[PDB]
Subunit: 543 residues, 2 copies
C-alpha cells in the first residue's frame, strides 16, 4: 500500500530518528502535513515515542522552553514564517531547540531567508522527507493542485505554467520514490500537452534515481509503468450519477473536506474508519443491508474495573454503525427525491443502449422533459446536456442554444458546456476543424454483456478498460506509447485534471482481481466530483 | 397491573369518548399529565384514534382554528390559566372548541374563575378522570407530596396539618378506586400518627365505595389489604448505597426529574423505554454485560422506499443501547471513585455481621478512618454516622459530638443526625425516656443464609420481609393490626415519608415470585433518595 510507504518514513525517518534519551518533544505540523500524518499513523504510535504533544504550526499554542520541537511542515511561506516566529527572538524562544523536517526540498529563496533568521541558531536538524503528495487512500493519492486544471485547459494560462507543471512532475516523482519505483512512462498521445508533461515527469524521476539507485529494485519492480492521462480521455465517467456508497455520498451530500456532518455531530470519512473502508465501494442497494449484517456480526463478538475500559470503545463501535446508516439514509433519500429520474436519462445516454439494448429517441427527447423539470437543478441539467452532446459527438451552435433555453441555465453557467471542448471533447458540431475521436464511447470499447445486475448502474469507466489492459500487458501503443522504450508490478496511472470516485473504485477492483500480482495506483491533481468538475470548467471562462 | 387501569381510563374515557365522526383533534397535556399518558399508552394507539397532534398546554404551539381540542390537564393555576389564554379572546381563538378532561376534581376557586372566562363558551365537555396520584411505575405510585414528611415529622407543624394529611388520604383513596379495590386497612402501631392517619384513609375510601359499589368486586378483591407504614419502620434501607442499576444511578448521578443528561444529549428514564424497564433492577456487576447481550439479540432481528422507514426507528434502538451503557458507565466510574469504600463500612453496619458473619470492632473504628477520608463527602459521612448510631441503638450526646467533629460536618448539617429521632429511631442514647424498638435490625428478622452472591450487597429491606408475610397471609397484628376487622389479591403498601428504589425493587421481586397470584403495589408521599432523605430531615430544624 502507498499508505504503508508514507507511514514508514514518518516513523523511521522522523519520530524515531529524533526519539532519543528518555526525554520529550512536541510535534509541530501544518494543514497539509497533519493531513498525511493523520492518514498513515495513529497518535498512539506517535505519542508513545516521546511525542508529548502535537499541534498546528499556525494556530498559536503555549510555549515549552525546555522541550525540543520537531517541525514536520511544508516549505511554504506561511509555515516557514510561523517557524521563524517561534524563535523570532532568542532570550524568549519557545522550545529549547528545533528539528526541522520539510515535506519536500525547500525553495532556495525561502531556505536562504531562513538561514538569515534568528531561528538558524536553534536548528539542530534539517532534512526533508520527500512527500509532495497526499495519500488520500490506500491506492489513491492527490497532488492537491486543482489549479493545474486551469494551467492545462485554460488557453490564456499556457505561458507561465511550466513552473506549475513541473511541480506536479516533482510531486509525482516523490510518489514513485516513496514507492521505491522507477517505472516506464507512457501517455495518451491523442492530447498533446501529455507528451510534453510526460517529459518533466521523467526528468524529475531520473533525478530521483540518481540520488538513490534503490529506486526500482530488482524483483518485479521494472515491469512497473506510469501512465499519464488527460481529463479528456473520458468526459463521461466524471459526469455520471454513481450509485456506490462513497461515489454517491459525495455527489448528493454536502461533504466539505471529507467531513460528513448530519442531524450537530460530525464525522470524518477516513481510512481509519474500518466500516467506511468496507462500505465505500458498495451499491446503495445493499449498503444499509450489509451495514446491519455487520452490526450483528459485531455483537456476537462481545460474549468490573477492567470492564469500565471495554466500554469507551464499545461506544465508538455503535457510533460508526449509526453514522453509516445515517449516511446511507441521507443517500437513499436524495435518490428518490430526484436522482433515480436523472439516472435513467444519463445511463441511456452513456450506454447508447438502455436496459434492453435498443437505441433511443435521441435528438431532443427524454432530455427536454427533464430539462423542464422544475425540481431538477441547473447543474443537473448541464450534466444531462453535456452527456447528451457527447453522445451526439457534437451539436450545432443553434440546437445547443436551444437546449440551454429550455433549461433556463443562467448565463454564468452557459459557457461551462462550451469549454468542455478545451479538454478535447467535441461539443460544437462543425467548428470547421479536424475531426475528434471518442475512445470512451461504448461502441469503441471491448464488449461487455448487457447483464448488469442494476439498471441504473450500466456504465463502466473507460479507465477500467485501460487498466485491465495494461495489467494483462496488452495496452495499445499508438495511443498510449512509452516515453521511448520499455515494457510490484505496479501500475501507476495519473490523470491531469482530476479523477472520480468511480475511477478510484475501479482501481481497487482491477487491483483485487485477475491481478497478475499487479497493483493499480490511481492518482491525480485533485479528487473530482460531478459538480466539482463543472465548477472546474467554469473557471476557464470566468476565473 | 395499575398500568392497565390507567391505560383504560385514558382511552375509554378520553380518547375514544371524544373520537367522533371522521374528524380530527389535538391532544393538549401538561407536565404531569403527559407523564402518565406516556406511561400507559403509546402515541400509536392515540394518534390513530383521531389525534393528529399532541402537545404541552404551556409550551406555546401553532393554532388550529378548525380543530376541536382535547385538554387532558391537571387543575393547577398554570394549566387552567394557559387554557384560559388559548381562548382569552374569541374572534381569534385557536381550536374551534374545547373538551376539558381534568386529572382530578377542580378547585371550586379555580373552577369558578374558569366559568367567568371568555373560555367558558368554547367548552363543549367538562369532566375529570379522578387520578389524584402519579402512576410512577407499573407497581409504584407517588402522591408527589414531599411536604407531608414535615407535616408528619416536624413537631411545630402538627396543628394545621389535618388539611394536608387528609388530602393524602383523598389521593390514596383514588388509587384504590382507580384499581377497583376496597382493601382492608392495616398500619404499623409502633408509631401513633399511623392509626390516626389510617382513619382518614378509611373514611376517604368509604366515601368512594358509596359513589360506586363496584369498588371491591367479588373475585379475589376482598383479600386485598392496604398497609400504612411510617418512614421510621426502617431508617436503614433508605440510607444504604444500593448497587442495582436504577437504585445506584439515582444516588450517584445528578438525575433531575427522572431525566439523565450526559456527555449535550439528554434522555428520560421512563416506562416507555423498554430497555430501562428490563435493566433498572439489575446489579451493576452484570448491567453492561446483559445490556450488550441484548444489543446482539436485537441485531439478529433485522435479518428501498419501504426501508427508508425501517430506519428512523432502527436509529432509536441504537441510541437506547448507547445511553444505557453510557449510563451504566457513569455508574461504574463513581463506584471506584469512592463508593466501594463506603459500601464496605455500611454493609457491615447494616448487616451487623460482615461478609463472614463475624461481628466487628464497633464503637469508633472503621468509621473514623472514613470520617477523615478527605475525598468522601459531608453527606456520605452523615449517612455512615446515622447507620452507625442506628447500629449502636443510640449514642451519647458526647460521642455523637465527637464523630461530628472528626467529620468536619458543617453546623448546618449537624442536626440532620439528631432529627432522625423524630421518626422513632433512637439516636441520643439516654434522653431519659421510654425504650424504643428496632424491628428492622437483622437479628430481629427471620434468618436468611449468609450466602449473598455479592459482598457489597448483603442487606435486605425489612419492607420485603413485611410483604412476603402479608402475601403468605402471616403478618403479625400486634404490630400491624387491621383498622378494625378483616383478613387481585392486591397488597397496597403506603409509606408516609418517602420510599427507596431498593424498596420499589422489592415490591417487584415479591410480586413476581411465590405470589399466590398476589401483586404488591408500593406507593408513597414521594420517591426518596439517600441524600434526598437527608435533605428531608434537614427541613425539620431548618425549613
Amino acid at each position: 500500500a502507498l499508505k504503508t510507504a508514507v507511514h514508514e518514513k514518518i516513523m523511521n525517518d522522523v519520530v524515531l530518528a529524533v526519539k532519543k534519551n528518555a526525554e520529550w518533544k512536541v510535534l509541530i505540523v501544518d494543514q497539509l502535513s497533519m493531513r498525511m500524518v493523520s492518514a498513515c499513523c495513529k497518535m498512539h504510535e506517535i505519542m508513545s515515542e516521546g511525542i508529548t504533544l502535537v499541534e498546528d504550526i499556525n494556530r498559536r499554542r503555549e510555549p515549552l522552553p525546555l522541550l525540543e520541537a520537531v517541525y514536520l511542515i511544508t516549505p511554504t511561506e506561511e509555515s516557514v514564517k510561523c517557524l521563524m516566529a517561534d524563535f523570532q527572538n532568542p532570550d524568549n524562544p519557545q522550545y529549547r531547540g528545533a528539528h526541522i523536517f520539510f515535506t519536500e526540498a525547500c525553495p532556495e529563496e525561502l531556505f536562504k531567508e531562513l538561514c538569515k533568521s534568528t531561528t538558524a541558531r536553534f536548528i539542530k536538524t534539517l532534512k526533508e522527507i520527500n512527500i509532495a503528495f497526499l495519500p488520500y487512500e490506500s491506492q489513491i493519492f492527490s497532488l492537491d493542485s486543482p489549479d493545474t486544471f486551469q494551467v492545462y485547459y485554460n488557453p490564456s494560462r499556457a505561458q507561465g505554467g511550466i513552473p506549475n507543471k513541473e511541480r506536479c512532475a516533482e510531486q509525482i516523482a516523490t510518489l514513485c520514490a516513496t514507492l521505491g519505483e522507477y517505472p516506464s512512462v507512457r501517455y495518451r498521445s491523442d492530447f498533446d500537452e501529455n507528451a510534453s508533461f510526460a517529459q518533466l515527469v521523467q526528468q524529475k524521476l531520473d533525478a530521483y534515481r540518481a540520488d538513490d539507485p534503490t529506486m526500482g529494485e530488482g524483483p518485479q519492480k521494472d515491469r512497473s509503468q506510469l501512465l499519464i492521462l488527460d481529463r479528456g480521455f473520458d468526459p463521461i465517467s466524471p459526469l455520471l450519477h454513481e450509485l456506490t456508497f462513497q461515489a454517491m455520498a459525495y455527489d448528493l451530500l454536502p461533504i466539505e473536506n471529507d467531513v460528513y456532518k448530519y442531524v450537530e455531530k460530525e464525522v470524518l470519512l477516513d481510512e481509519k474508519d474500518d466500516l467506511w473502508v468496507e462500505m465505500r465501494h458498495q451499491h446503495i442497494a445493499v449498503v444499509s443491508q450489509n451495514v446491519t449484517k455487520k452490526l450483528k456480526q459485531f455483537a456476537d463478538e462481545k460474549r468490573l474495573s477492567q470492564m469500565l475500559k471495554k466500554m469507551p470503545q464499545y461506544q465508538k463501535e455503535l457510533s460508526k454503525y449509526s453514522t453509516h446508516l445515517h449516511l446511507a439514509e441521507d443517500c437513499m433519500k436524495q435518490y428518490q427525491q430526484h436522482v433515480d429520474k436523472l439516472c435513467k436519462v444519463e445511463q441511456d445516454l452513456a450506454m447508447g443502449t438502455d436496459a434492453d439494448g435498443e437505441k433511443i429517441r435521441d435528438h431532443m427527447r427524454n432530455i427536454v422533459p427533464i430539462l423542464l423539470d422544475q425540481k431538477i437543478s441547473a447543474y443537473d441539467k448541464i450534466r444531462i446536456i453535456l452527456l447528451y452532446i457527447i453522445h451526439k459527438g457534437g451539436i450545432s451552435e443553434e440546437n445547443l442554444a436551444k437546449l440551454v433555453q429550455h433549461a433556463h441555465i443562467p448565463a454564468e453557467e452557459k459557457w461551462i458546456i462550451n469549454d468542455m471542448q478545451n479538454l478535447g471533447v467535441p461539443i460544437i458540431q462543425d467548428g470547421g476543424r479536424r475531426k475528434i475521436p471518442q475512445p470512451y464511447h461504448t461502441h469503441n470499447r471491448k464488449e461487455r454483456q448487457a447483464d448488469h445486475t442494476y439498471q441504473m448502474s450500466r456504465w463502466t469507466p473507460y479507465m477500467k478498460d485501460i487498466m485491465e489492459a495494461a495489467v494483462e500487458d496488452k495496452l495499445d501503443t499508438r495511443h498510449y506509447p512509452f516515453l521511448n522504450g520499455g515494457g510490484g508490478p505496479r501500475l501507476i496511472i495519473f490523470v491531469v485534471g482530476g479523477i472520480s470516485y468511480s475511477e478510484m473504485r475501479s482501481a481497487y477492483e482491477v487491483t483485487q482481481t485477475a491481478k497478475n500480482n499487479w497493483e493499480v495506483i490511481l492518482g491525480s491533481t485533485h479528487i473530482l466530483t460531478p459538480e466539482g468538475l463543472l465548477r472546474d470548467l467554469r473557471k476557464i471562462s470566468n476565473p
